Amino acid sequence: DVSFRLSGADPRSYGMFIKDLRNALPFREKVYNIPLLLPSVSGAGRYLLMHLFNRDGKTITVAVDVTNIYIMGYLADTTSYFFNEPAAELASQYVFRDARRKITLPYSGDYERLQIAAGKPREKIPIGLPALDSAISTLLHYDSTAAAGALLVLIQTTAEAARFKYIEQQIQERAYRDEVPSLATISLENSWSGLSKQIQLAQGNNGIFRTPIVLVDNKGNRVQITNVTSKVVTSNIQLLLNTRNI
Questions:
Q1: Where is carbohydrate linked to this protein?
Q2: Residue (of 42, 58, 55, 72) closest to 158 by Cα position
Q3: ∠ CA 209-215-218 to the nearest 5 degrees?
Q4: Buried b / exposed e across 75-103, counting CB within 10 Å, b at 16+?
């Protein structure tokens, strides 16, 4: 399991947690020195449990699918909550089985349903370490509208940070003040799947991408990744989604 405590947290410890989180995922290969995530894992071993403590020390346990690093649900003292989609229902067989109560949230856990539920698009929710502390507090007492926003902040400060070094570094920047994500950040979150595919396809095409990926990213709007020597590949993307799962 991996843990993070917001009390005493600074850009350094967060980075340490994110490094642990990455390291906790398994992989067999490395495509271009990036860890390729497994296509399938079976049983309880498919799920990683994160323990998040807020400043006051209250805690949730979050369940993450190690094949794609998707949050399945979480446990707040004696109640588990799970997204409304078949994968989370499947997870519910293996995790938080000792919970006194299992609640299914009125939505699936993809951004589009989550933004609708929260009333705000991602572009307008401040993320940061202060926001994560808040998120954790929100999740401790059920409110499904308020939990959609907390989970948009939770996904981004853990899963999206594990996935991309740029986004992890954004959050270290937001360790004592929250700020809405940059466009680059929204660009990157959306492109993980395509990027993973094109990088995997590039083996046996000389590191060249079959189809160009256009990121808005940090060229204001409209960058285009063509091959694996791009910095988004050498320096940024940190875990690849296995093509079988794409």
A1: 227
A2: 72
A3: 125
A4: bbeebbbbbebebbeebbeebbeebeeee
Whether residue 38 contacts residue 28, with contact meaning beta carbons closer than 8 Å, is answered with yes
Tokens of 110: 């993809």
Residue 103 CA to its chain's centroid (Å): 22
- Calpha distance 14→50 (Å, rounded): 13
* Chain-centre distance for alpha carbon 152: 10
How buried is residue 49: exposed, middle or buried, by Cβ count under 10 Å (0-12/13-18/19+)? middle
d(CA 107, CA 88): 11
Pairing verdict, β 34-37 and 70-76: unpaired
- In the residue annotation, 160 being an active-site residue is answered as yes
Q: What is the dihedral of CA 4, 239, 38, 1, to 10 degrees?
A: -10
Query: Which of 85, 160, 168, 189 is an active site residue?
Result: 160
Q: What approach was used to elucidate this structure?
A: X-ray
Give the number of other Cβ atoms within 10 Å of residue 245's Cβ: 14
Structural domains of the chain, with CATH: 1-162 (3.40.420.10), 163-246 (4.10.470.10)
